[PDB]
Amino acid sequence: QVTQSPEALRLQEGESSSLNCSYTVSGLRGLFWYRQDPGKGPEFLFTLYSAGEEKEKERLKATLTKKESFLHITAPKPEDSATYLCAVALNNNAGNMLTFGGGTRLMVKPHIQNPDPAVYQLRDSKSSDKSVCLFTDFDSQTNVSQSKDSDVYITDKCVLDMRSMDFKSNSAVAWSNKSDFACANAFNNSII
Amino acid sequence: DIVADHVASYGVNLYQSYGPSGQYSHEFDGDEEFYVDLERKETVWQLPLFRRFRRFDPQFALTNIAVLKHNLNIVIKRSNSTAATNEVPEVTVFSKSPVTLGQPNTLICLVDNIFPPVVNITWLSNGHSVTEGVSETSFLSKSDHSFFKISYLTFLPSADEIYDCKVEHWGLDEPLLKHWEP
Amino acid sequence: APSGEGSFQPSQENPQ
Amino acid sequence: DSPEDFVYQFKGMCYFTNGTERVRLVTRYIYNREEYARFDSDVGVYRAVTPLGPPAAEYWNSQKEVLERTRAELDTVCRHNYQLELRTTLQRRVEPTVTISPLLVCSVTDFYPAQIKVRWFRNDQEETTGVVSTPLIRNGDWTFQILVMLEMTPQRGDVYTCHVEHPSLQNPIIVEWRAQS
Amino acid sequence: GVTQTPKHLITATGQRVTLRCSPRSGDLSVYWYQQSLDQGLQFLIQYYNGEERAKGNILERFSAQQFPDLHSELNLSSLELGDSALYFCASSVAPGSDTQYFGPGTRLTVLEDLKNVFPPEVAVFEPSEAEISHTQKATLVCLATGFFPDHVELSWWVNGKEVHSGVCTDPQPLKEQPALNDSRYALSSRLRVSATFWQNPRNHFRCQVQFYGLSENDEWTQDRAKPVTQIVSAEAWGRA
Ligand SMILES: *[C@@H]1O[C@H](CO)[C@@H](O)[C@H](O)[C@H]1NC(C)=O
Ligand SMILES: *[C@@H]1O[C@H](CO)[C@@H](O)[C@H](O)[C@H]1NC(C)=O
Ligand SMILES: [Ca+2]
Ligand SMILES: [Ca+2]
Numbered sequence A: 001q002v003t004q005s006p007e008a009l010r011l012q013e014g015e016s017s018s019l020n021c022s023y024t025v026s027g028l029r030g031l032f033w034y035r036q037d038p039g040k041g042p043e044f045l046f047t048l049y050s051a052g053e054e055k056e057k058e059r060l061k062a063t064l065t066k067k068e069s070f071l072h073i074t075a076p077k078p079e080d081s082a083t084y085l086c087a088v089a090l091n092n093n094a095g096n097m098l099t100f101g102g103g104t105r106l107m108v109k110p111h112i113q114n115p116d117p118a119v120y121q122l123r124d125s126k127s128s129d130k131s132v133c134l135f136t137d138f139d140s141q142t143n144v145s146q147s148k149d150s151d152v153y154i155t156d157k158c159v160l161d162m163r164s165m166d167f168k169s170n171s172a173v174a175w176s177n178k179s180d181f182a183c184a185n186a187f188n189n190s191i192i
Numbered sequence B: 001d002i003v004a005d006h007v008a009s010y011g012v013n014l015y016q017s018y019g020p021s022g023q024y025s026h027e028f029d030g031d032e033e034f035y036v037d038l039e040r041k042e043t044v045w046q047l048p049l050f051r052r053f054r055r056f057d058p059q060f061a062l063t064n065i066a067v068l069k070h071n072l073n074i075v076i077k078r079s080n081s082t083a084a085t086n087e088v089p090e091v092t093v094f095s096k097s098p099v100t101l102g103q104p105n106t107l108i109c110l111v112d113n114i115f116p117p118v119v120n121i122t123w124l125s126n127g128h129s130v131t132e133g134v135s136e137t138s139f140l141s142k143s144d145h146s147f148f149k150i151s152y153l154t155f156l157p158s159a160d161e162i163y164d165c166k167v168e169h170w171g172l173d174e175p176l177l178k179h180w181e182p
Numbered sequence C: 001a002p003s004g005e006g007s008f009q010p011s012q013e014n015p016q
Numbered sequence D: 001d002s003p004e005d006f007v008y009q010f011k012g013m014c015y016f017t018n019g020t021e022r023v024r025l026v027t028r029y030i031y032n033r034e035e036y037a038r039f040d041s042d043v044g045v046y047r048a049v050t051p052l053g054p055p056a057a058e059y060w061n062s063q064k065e066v067l068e069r070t071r072a073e074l075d076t077v078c079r080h081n082y083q084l085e086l087r088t089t090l091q092r093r094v095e096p097t098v099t100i101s102p103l104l105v106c107s108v109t110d111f112y113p114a115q116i117k118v119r120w121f122r123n124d125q126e127e128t129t130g131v132v133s134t135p136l137i138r139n140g141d142w143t144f145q146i147l148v149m150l151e152m153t154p155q156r157g158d159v160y161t162c163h164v165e166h167p168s169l170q171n172p173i174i175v176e177w178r179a180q181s
Numbered sequence E: 001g002v003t004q005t006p007k008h009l010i011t012a013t014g015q016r017v018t019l020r021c022s023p024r025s026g027d028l029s030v031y032w033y034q035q036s037l038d039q040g041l042q043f044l045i046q047y048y049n050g051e052e053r054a055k056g057n058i059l060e061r062f063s064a065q066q067f068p069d070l071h072s073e074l075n076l077s078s079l080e081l082g083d084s085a086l087y088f089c090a091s092s093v094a095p096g097s098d099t100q101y102f103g104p105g106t107r108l109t110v111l112e113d114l115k116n117v118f119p120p121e122v123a124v125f126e127p128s129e130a131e132i133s134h135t136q137k138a139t140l141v142c143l144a145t146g147f148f149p150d151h152v153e154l155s156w157w158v159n160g161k162e163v164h165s166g167v168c169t170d171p172q173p174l175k176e177q178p179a180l181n182d183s184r185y186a187l188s189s190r191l192r193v194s195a196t197f198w199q200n201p202r203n204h205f206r207c208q209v210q211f212y213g214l215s216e217n218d219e220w221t222q223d224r225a226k227p228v229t230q231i232v233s234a235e236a237w238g239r240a
Helices: B049-052 B058-078 D053-063 D064-085 E129-135
Strands: A003-004 A008-011 A019-022 A026-037 A041-047 A054-057 A062-066 A068-073 A082-089 A104-109 A120-123 A131-136 A160-163 A168-176 B008-014 B021-028 B031-037 B040-044 B090-095 B105-114 B120-125 B128-129 B134-136 B145-155 B163-168 B177-181 D007-017 D022-031 D036-038 D046-048 D097-101 D104-111 D115-120 D129-131 D144-150 D159-165 D173-178 E003-004 E008-012 E017-022 E029-036 E038-046 E053-054 E063-067 E070-078 E085-092 E106-111 E119-126 E137-147 E152-158 E161-163 E167-169 E185-193 E204-213 E231-238
Touching: A003 A041, A003 A082, A003 B021, A008 A019, A008 B031, A008 E063, A026 A062, A026 D064, A026 E017, A041 A054, A041 B049, A041 D064, A054 E003, A062 B177, A068 A082, A104 B031, A104 B105, A120 B040, A131 E137, A160 E003, A160 E167, B008 B058, B008 E063, B021 B163, B040 B058, B090 B163, B090 B177, B090 E231, B105 B120, B105 B163, B105 D007, B105 E185, B120 B134, B134 E106, B145 B163, D007 E231, D022 D064, D036 D053, D046 D053, D097 D159, D097 D173, D104 D115, D104 D159, D104 E063, D115 D144, D159 E038, E008 E017, E017 E085, E017 E106, E029 E070, E038 E070, E070 E085, E119 E204, E129 E137, E137 E204, E137 E231, E152 E185, E185 E204
Parallel strands: A008 A104, E008 E106, E119 E231
Antiparallel strands: A003 A019, A019 A068, A026 A041, A026 A082, A054 A062, A062 A068, A082 A104, A120 A131, A131 A168, A160 A168, B008 B021, B008 D007, B021 B031, B031 B040, B090 B105, B105 B145, B120 B128, B120 B163, B134 B145, B163 B177, D007 D022, D022 D036, D036 D046, D097 D104, D104 D144, D115 D159, D129 D144, D159 D173, E003 E017, E017 E070, E029 E038, E029 E085, E038 E053, E063 E070, E085 E106, E119 E137, E137 E185, E152 E161, E152 E204, E167 E185, E204 E231
């Protein structure tokens, strides 16, 4: 039995934290930490065999006791957002297979230095038949809800990073097939 | 040689070309705790108490044995196919407890200096072969990398029966017969 | 409940 | 004429001294009867033992993951299994069965652990001269055996006493043999 | 090091599929794991040197092999909707406690029938003139719609070279018809650039959506194009 806590973690850029991985058994062969991008293969981080063991690479530091393992993450960046998986090899197991914990879904919310919330209408595509509204440059404490219309569709918020300008911005897209579709009634009861 | 209060093997891993065959066992102070039956995929503990508090999964043994199979084939090439040399085993037969005629007892046949670990240990009564009431240990490891194996024959001693322990090994020209009588 | 026995693993010879 | 055999041995050994205080591991890689490579916890790296060992020892010493796992085996195997030994093997106390058969053999049968002390007495006195004992006998079923012979010329009043001490006993087992006729 | 083929697989119930894996160079042990939304990451089976080692709570319907070249094949027969998951292959140097290295995984979607499989419609939306005249930044929005299942990879190509800077794509696609179970999906992606970069008519922007669908083998018995694994794109040249 291997348990991970919390199931989900929401951290701010630079907000240090710890990930727990408890294992009820006794008889460890090895405790492993992996980082997984959604849909991608788990990427190996550290192996700990023994209590009092510790390993460090970059912003990550793994420690081990008789009961659990901690994954310390100091001053995280938005690139550190992933599902962090803890796995154990055990004497009680029927061989060398790994038993994974449920994982910790880590989300590192970037800091928006200059927030300028604005709604813009985009130019219609001659092939699309659809109209697109863009809610952008809002702060990280501001999010967008699901649509309250059968015709209008609101996407989730999403962050992009302009590397050359070192600029990070939040954005949400709204669209409909209606001719009477306006951006004013698109996000009227959608901004939360 | 290492001086210790207790010496343990977790475990003795054996794999030989002849067969081919293998063995997995855990030892503590020269006694076998358990062996894994690699065909049945089962751990056979030697004392009853041990199962209550201890559990070994057989797959670990089977996995170790596969690694030994891999290592063996590489080392045979490196040694330029040097084969094993056949040693002469030493046979000693003694009873388990003092002989009381008509009462339960066990005859012990110690076969020492076994290499390689391929041996036939059988019991005779008045010259004829006995099959029931016969048990034996696994190949118990030795510091010189040879082995010893102990065979058992449960019986009620009597004035009319004389026993022999027939041991067949490649290091012997003829089967070794070690006699015992009450 | 019985605890799982520890066991040594043999190091694997270089295949190549 | 004899069948050819190639034999491989792996021995994962633990050496325990003064309870838990001192623990040493030695893994042994053996071809036929030849140990060609080993890992010793006091050394901390793989070492070749014969000219058959350098290709294996150097390759395992180049793999930091192999070194880490093997060094950790002192905890994951030795110290771990010793906790299980304290509940099992180091609990086992089998009392000896002491009998005298007639020159006079004191057979001490089926005991565990190995530690044993047998002493022969004629009447009040202890007997050092005529005493010939077999070495400790391992039965292979987690019991031991020992036979202590006493060269005696029995008189009329004589009482012969076999005195036996073992960790399983609070007091020594005293078995006597009176002179015949 | 570990490679896995195919990256995506879409198939009907009752069908049989083969997932292949190539371990890291020099790795002799292979392990299969299934990652489902219900049970998370679970062990299936292990192979070493061509033989089966550790085995999980795998079903009789599931069988694997490890070839002498050490590549493994995971065979899943009489497929059910519950078999829809990610199947990861892992490899390690030796078959003990050695570090297990995972492959990119195979995403399998098992459907009742393949009649509801559709590729996306891709449209690019030019940046707001008001946005440019306020932030001196230009956000290009790509909109992929009407596709089913959600086996899509969205990328932005500027003048023929793929880019990731200032690009943000929706985490999950949204259901166009939430009340329907096999609803077609929609996904949006954003490319934010400088005003000077968009106002340059020399620059070519192309939103590419790689849809994963049917294979060469699979039978199509509809009077419409087969919805095979295809690239659907939309483009826009810079406007001044
Ligand atoms: C053991 O007995 C079998 C069957 O009789 C025989 O084939 C084998 O050669 C014997 N082994 C030895 C070492 O004599
Ligand atoms: C045995 O261990 C104890 C506890 O560490 C220590 O006090 C004692 O001196 C040790 N004995 C020897 C002979 O080292
Ligand atoms: Ca949403
Ligand atoms: Ca036995």
